[PDB]
Design a protein around this ligand. Structure first.
Ligand SMILES: CCCCCCCC/C=C\CCCCCCCC(=O)O[C@H](COC(=O)CCCCCCCCCCCCCCC)COP(=O)(O)OC[C@@H](O)CO
Ligand SMILES: CCCCCCCC/C=C\CCCCCCCC(=O)O[C@H](COC(=O)CCCCCCCCCCCCCCC)COP(=O)(O)OC[C@@H](O)CO
Ligand SMILES: CCCCCCCC/C=C\CCCCCCCC(=O)O[C@H](COC(=O)CCCCCCCCCCCCCCC)COP(=O)(O)OC[C@@H](O)CO
Ligand SMILES: CCCCCCCC/C=C\CCCCCCCC(=O)O[C@H](COC(=O)CCCCCCCCCCCCCCC)COP(=O)(O)OC[C@@H](O)CO
Ligand SMILES: Nc1ncnc2c1ncn2[C@@H]1O[C@@H]2COP(=O)(O)O[C@H]2[C@H]1O
Ligand SMILES: Nc1ncnc2c1ncn2[C@@H]1O[C@@H]2COP(=O)(O)O[C@H]2[C@H]1O
Ligand SMILES: Nc1ncnc2c1ncn2[C@@H]1O[C@@H]2COP(=O)(O)O[C@H]2[C@H]1O
Ligand SMILES: Nc1ncnc2c1ncn2[C@@H]1O[C@@H]2COP(=O)(O)O[C@H]2[C@H]1O
Lengths: 395, 395, 395, 395
């Protein structure tokens, strides 16, 4: 964590130069009662490229050593004229490296479209400070206090970069006019960048909700063209509502394919944990049979009142309840045998042989259950002859 | 619905404080002939966190009880000085909860990109009121009527937040200059948010139309490279036109997979309702045979004049007409036997055996019909031996 | 086409009212030497809801009959005061219907994102005219000419709706201040709409190019991680370049699935037209064999210098050249047997039996050829016993 | 490269006319000491449509010959009045062709969304020059120097097109007011275009990162609903972190399908180069067996500590290590037999027969290995009987 606390320190130094240099270029009466601080900052900025190396002349390393040799403490100490001392701003090249560090250490828990906006706003304010100092530099010599004429310059630059333009402070000289033109263009560019960043950030703020909305609209639009009843359309709408309320509309089978096989098996083993550990025919088997079965359970959701099994039909599947309730009724739907809930299973008689069903099965709410076929079971039983022999015994 | 009519009430109270507090901070002559109303609002705002609980110190519950204890009726009653009475605006924190409620009760029948825009516009106007009151507060003491100087302040704040900047009202004091700078930045930020929200809302307004347009452009671009006739390109274009006119370009097979199996079966059973309930060989069968067949019918669209069956060839399919018309012609296309329309079927002789066809079949318009193979029929007939035996009898 | 020439007429009438009404409300000296025109327009606007019916009280029909009864010719003829004659602008509701017509008759050959922008710009200019008339109405009575004070009003409204705000024309009265505030908000909203529409239009202007660029970047990014030679990366890059130059990067197999089966068969029959009509073993067969084969040819592209067939190996495929050239070399690549070009084929000996190859085959440029397997050929030959018998004879 | 150096020359000529023509229309005292240059430019611009032809009256060729005949050197030489000499700007139509060339020669190594922005900025500055000259033309006759009144005009046009509007330079005449209105509209349009282009460019700057972020958020959102342990969620998160760090989240199987078969085979042969060239049972085989095997190896990633093979189970696969390390332990995980690293393989005994495993295999870090089944091996061995016979010998 020492790296983190030293990066904050070098940031606090490059934002010390980024506020002191342009403001010293305008007021030379400074730089005397801040020399103990700029010596310290120069030391703490020159003894940082070794440490970075312990982690030359490269396309992404030139700023770090260009912003480290003391161009300052020389132009201010020797009192160089105006055109040649303006290279004292080479220390601000360190800001590039600072940004390049902050865009890769903090980019784990922050939206990449918001960190860019925060960096842009910080750069805009830090450039507005320099623009205010520049505007204040090329003004007629006056006797006003330093803070009043800094306030006027900052007011002018803020009213120019936001494209408001009150007009109470205007150029009065060719040089001021050229400066105003160039920084009018700069302000337009910066405001355009801000608007574009905000538009990008807002445009991608509700993705799952809009995807679910449009895939419901598409289904309803196609479904009305085929002239299907209002009742069944209402059932479909309420199913989509339940899907959005529970799992935000994500499809289980397309979600559980971005995982590699061992993680997918671990997830499946923690989901279908206890359910298959109590099935009367799978007992006596090893862990490889169970692990083979668990990967072939297929999910399906049944709404309220829907039929799962009809009494009399052949049937070949077996169902495991996960997150719902189920009722068992006779062939006439008049006598209720029992009620099954999470963790239990029904239909285990179909795997043994293809005898017709013996009772009717009705969903009481949204069931969210898993099912296993018979051909899949036969294929994955043809490899474990001892188990298949035992099943033949029970048959 | 009582919850809905009480949420509107608490909204009408938090927009009563949001208009009365900043305007009372400027004009102290108020708060005497509005005390019966603010007592009532304070009661109706303190007796709302129990009811919310009947539905503490949580990250999303702190505003509700911070905006409920009467910081008002104390600063105004005891006449606290300017810097310390400004915490009377804690009641405006209730606006967060109000927004958080309106974004989850009304988010069922409203585009999520439009509710955010409406909330943003409401917040912008409600903040412009407060900014106008703030600007009017730090002005020199004058004798003008209260409404004229409220009109001037509102005019200034509206001409600043829209980034127009006429310039007839400008700062004339350091404090006014600092206030103007900060709210120039606020106005730029708000206008950027508005533009970004509008851009996001507009960018996603024609999705199906643009998707259809680009998937037609891609087909034509690829299709010209292979040097294919203008006639067949015109046929493809008119097919895509018909598809867009009828079902907005949605593909039937990719649409009918977002449904679970029972809903998909219900949809198919209501689509292919009567058609298979009159087929001469499927009669005598149960409901499971029909329900098995219905899930294996495959859609296909035939344009005008196209050939569906050629006289003499082997053939193995059977076709059910859904939304079109069909004509039956002899081997020489000279004598018209009959005309079939919606609900009827042809080609049933191919399922029994592989004898060559007996007549030619021509589409009269866009047919939009369903078809069943023979290998699929054989696979799904190998499980119902009684039916297969009867088919063997008819063969 | 008479409908098209009459819709233009009703557009020219609703843009006659949309320019005459607000300008007459300000200058009452008009409406005398334009009565023969507004009578004609009223007739041509009342005798248009029957014709629309030949193509009441509906949610999308109320404007058509609200904008048809003569509220005009009554307020101007009886000289109604200012607050009550302002309902003369009900005729501008016809603009909604006009827009609703122009958005569905011209929406076939125009980008839907550009028609909306053109409509928005037209509405903005037509509203700016009315705003200028409104501003000119509530001004002090002056003696200036009508065109000079219309020019000043139009200048003010254009400098307000574009958010420029020069400030040389400003309010000077409470009513003018309220008007200015409301239309400052209107101008901000309109400029936001314009910017959002332009952003949407520009954001979707190069789709295929960006898709190809990103799918090349993804391939190269993954391909460098596996540490694969610069030569083969250059070959992949030049293959993608050739694909983009010829068919804009579109994949043949994913393109040729948006067509229904008869159109897909027609496309395939026009592509592989002559090639299979000269193959020595397929001769003597009917049209159904050819039509069955044509649907199972699979495309593949070979770059320059690549090997297609190695002398000595078993091999099972047959290749048809479509858009390239091929050379045939001996086992030592020293003696060049022959050169094949578009329309010819090689490898036909593999279908008869699985004898080893007899010569080497090299691509001379990007070949763009089609291939047929052997198992597919065997499956689709097992249904036509006469042909399979003849092949057995040649074997 | 001569074409490249001549296109730069014609660009430097069309940006010579684009700066000289409007500035000469205002100051007639020019055009005498620049005739040797405009004669040269006219020659170098008329002798460029033959060379373009060596690479008429076409929809995309009309500018090239409209901007080549000397409308200049005639209006300036004969001193034509103001309304008729304004067609001297036909030479600026050459800018269209120049842009149309620069958008297709430099569009290989530049983002298409950035070249458009650079072209737009260049056009905006070049139009601002002309707008400044136009504004300076219709001003009262003054005695000021030419550069001061060019500076004022450029200042006015820049403060108008950026929508700032200081207001210190304003119209003072009907013609100036009309000019100001039209170019206020132009400036609003240009600023809207700039903002839209910037928004489009920024909106698509982090695609892979956002895709990875959202596909991790979807997995975690679905994964919490099933109530799965924090440990396994942490394992999934760290797996996704490793995937992003190594290959930017790209899936190997969906990446390696955009290549044609020969390039895919070349890539696979360079990846699995040495590994299969040392396998004890595959030795003695030819190149076609290896080339057949290499296309059926399937990738899989194992995290640290995960189990790859359990001692005692049947097993049927064989694994090749690519970019990781593996340890071999006994049945009790107490004695470490050996350590395998990149280039080696384990599990080769399962292909010979289905005997149970003999040792446990544990990942030490993220392994990134390839695996081969047994049924696939059996299918692709049933075609090479000599190899299958040798395997039967070793079995
Ligand atoms: C978001 C929240 C942001 C808050 C920023 C607050 C900045 C506070 C700056 C100071 C605010 C302040 O009240 O001080 C003023 C003096 O400023 C001065 O002369 C000092 C001159 C320098 C002021 C600094 C300029 C940059 C301010 C940019 C602010 C926005 C940044 C975002 C007036 O006081 P005072 O009556 O004594 O006047 C002296 C006499 O001549 C007139 O009475
Ligand atoms: C969308 C539609 C929106 C409509 C808003 C209408 C707001 C109506 C506000 C009042 C409109 C109005 O006509 O009243 C004015 C008075 O305002 C006054 O002094 C009252 C002062 C307070 C005005 C309220 C300020 C906020 C207005 C923000 C409006 C936009 C909001 C969106 C002039 O009358 P009056 O000749 O008697 O002048 C008195 C004498 O001194 C000059 O003749
Ligand atoms: C894109 C291309 C667009 C071109 C628009 C051209 C509009 C032409 C309008 C007229 C242009 C014009 O030159 O006419 C002016 C007169 O305007 C007048 O008073 C007539 C007053 C009404 C002018 C119309 C106002 C709307 C103009 C909105 C234009 C942009 C629309 C986009 C000056 O002439 P004139 O020396 O005789 O002055 C009289 C004396 O008092 C001063 O010399
Ligand atoms: C990004 C970087 C961009 C840099 C642009 C620099 C442009 C340099 C232009 C000239 C800059 C300059 O300092 O020259 C000025 C003169 O301008 C003049 O009269 C010359 C008049 C023509 C100036 C050119 C106008 C377009 C400038 C558009 C610039 C932004 C373009 C982006 C003042 O000097 P000087 O004290 O002698 O005044 C004479 C006396 O009357 C007052 O002292
Ligand atoms: N009395 C009962 N209590 C609970 N479940 C039952 C009862 N009778 C039948 N079932 C279940 O209902 C199923 C319907 O027929 P199956 O042959 O699929 O197997 C049956 C059992 O799983
Ligand atoms: N006279 C007829 N009227 C209606 N349909 C017919 C007639 N003759 C043949 N068909 C249908 O046309 C089909 C063409 O040959 P099939 O063997 O497919 O079965 C035939 C019947 O379905
Ligand atoms: N002399 C030749 N001229 C043209 N093509 C040939 C010649 N010899 C062989 N081929 C083709 O090259 C193929 C290579 O071996 P096949 O058995 O696939 O069948 C061969 C023919 O199609
Ligand atoms: N002593 C050993 N050193 C290295 N690898 C081994 C050793 N013993 C077994 N293995 C490998 O571990 C595998 C586990 O059982 P298999 O039958 O798959 O084949 C085995 C060999 O590939």
């Amino acid at each position: 964590t020492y790296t983190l606390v030293w990066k904050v320190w070098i940031l606090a130094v490059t934002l010390y130069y980024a506020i002191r240099i342009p403001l010293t270029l305008v007021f030379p009466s400074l730089f005397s009662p801040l020399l103990p601080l700029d010596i310290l900052a120069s030391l703490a900025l020159i003894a940082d490229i070794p440490l970075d190396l312990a982690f030359l002349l490269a396309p992404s390393r030139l700023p770090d050593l260009l912003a480290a040799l003391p161009l300052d403490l020389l132009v201010f100490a020797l009192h160089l004229p105006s055109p040649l001392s303006l290279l004292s701003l080479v220390r601000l090249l360190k800001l590039i490296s600072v940004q390049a560090s902050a865009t890769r250490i903090l980019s784990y828990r922050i939206n990449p479209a918001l960190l860019r906006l925060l960096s842009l706003v910080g750069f805009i304010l830090l450039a507005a400070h320099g623009i205010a100092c520049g505007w204040m530099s090329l003004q007629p010599p006056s006797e006003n206090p330093a803070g009043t004429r800094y306030l006027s310059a900052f007011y002018w630059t803020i009213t120019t970069l936001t494209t408001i333009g009150y007009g109470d402070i205007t150029p009065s000289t060719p040089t001021q006019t050229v400066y105003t033109i160039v920084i009018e263009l700069l302000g337009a560019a910066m405001y355009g960048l801000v608007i574009g960043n905000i538009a990008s950030l807002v445009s991608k703020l509700d993705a799952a909700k809009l995807l679910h909305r449009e895939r419901v609209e598409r289904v309803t639009a196609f479904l009305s063209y085929k002239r299907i009843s209002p009742e069944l359309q209402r059932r479909i709408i309420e199913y989509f509502d339940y899907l959005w309320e529970t799992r935000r509309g994500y499809e289980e089978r397309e979600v559980l394919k971005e995982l590699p096989h061992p993680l997918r098996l671990a997830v499946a083993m923690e989901i279908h944990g206890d359910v298959i550990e109590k099935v009367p025919l799978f007992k006596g088997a090893g862990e490889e049979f169970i692990r083979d079965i668990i990967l072939h359970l297929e999910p399906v959701i049944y709404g309220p009142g829907e039929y799962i099994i009809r009494a009399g039909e052949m049937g070949s599947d077996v169902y495991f309840i996960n997150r719902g309730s189920v009722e068992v009724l006779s062939a006439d739907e008049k006598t209720r045998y029992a009620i099954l809930s999470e963790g239990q299973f029904f239909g285990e008689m179909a795997l043994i042989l293809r005898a017709p069903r013996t009772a009717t099965v009705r969903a009481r709410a949204f069931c969210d259950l898993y099912r296993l076929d018979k051909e899949t079971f036969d294929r994955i039983l043809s490899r474990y002859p001892e188990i298949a022999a035992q099943i033949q015994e029970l048959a």
